């Protein structure tokens, strides 16, 4: 899944 600070 995407990292805590992604997007």
């Amino acid at each position: 899944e995407l990292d805590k600070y992604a997007s």
Partner: antibody
Amino acid sequence: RITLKESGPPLVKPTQTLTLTCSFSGFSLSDFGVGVGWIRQPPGKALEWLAIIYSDDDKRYSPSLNTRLTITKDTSKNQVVLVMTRVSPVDTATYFCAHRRGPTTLFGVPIARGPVNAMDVWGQGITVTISS
Amino acid sequence: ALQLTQSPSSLSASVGDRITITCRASQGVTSALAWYRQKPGSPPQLLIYDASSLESGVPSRFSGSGSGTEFTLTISTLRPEDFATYYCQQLHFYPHTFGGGTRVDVRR
């Protein structure tokens, strides 16, 4: 100045449970968005990411080791513990814990996330050998 | 999962050379990539964070560029302490992968 240091048994036998402790100073696991992760390095091999835990208590694990890892924090003691169950010889490695910055804030407002993209301070590493 | 491939895996050089190590990701990782230098017997040390930002206290001969799937670390003037193994790390997707490393040794 941030410093971290790993502690635990240097030797462990197959099928046993390994508990590693990361004690740190210079930051609190209650600080905004901070993380502490664990990375291992079998002798002569590459670094391998294991897990990380943040101050808001979100936890993430390597999918390959998910079933054998538990990471937890003890905020008031400034420690992060990683428990690995059912170890086998391939788990012999040097284990490092490391700090991960949270976003920079301005008057308590997150304004920069670039600093979270790295594990910026590492502990010396603790060598663990798994053999019966 | 996501793959991070470093090139070259090994590289020979001499003091004063300019070297560049590259790291390619199987899917885009935006700018969430870090470079480290690890000397024998020591923990890895952060050189560059967020693909190109110079970490505080790190000498200016180190430079990082790129985003997406291709990144490069260049050391402009190799010093003796740079004979070591370098690693890149992706932090966009879990798990936070490391590349295989590239060993930089004394050419002869």
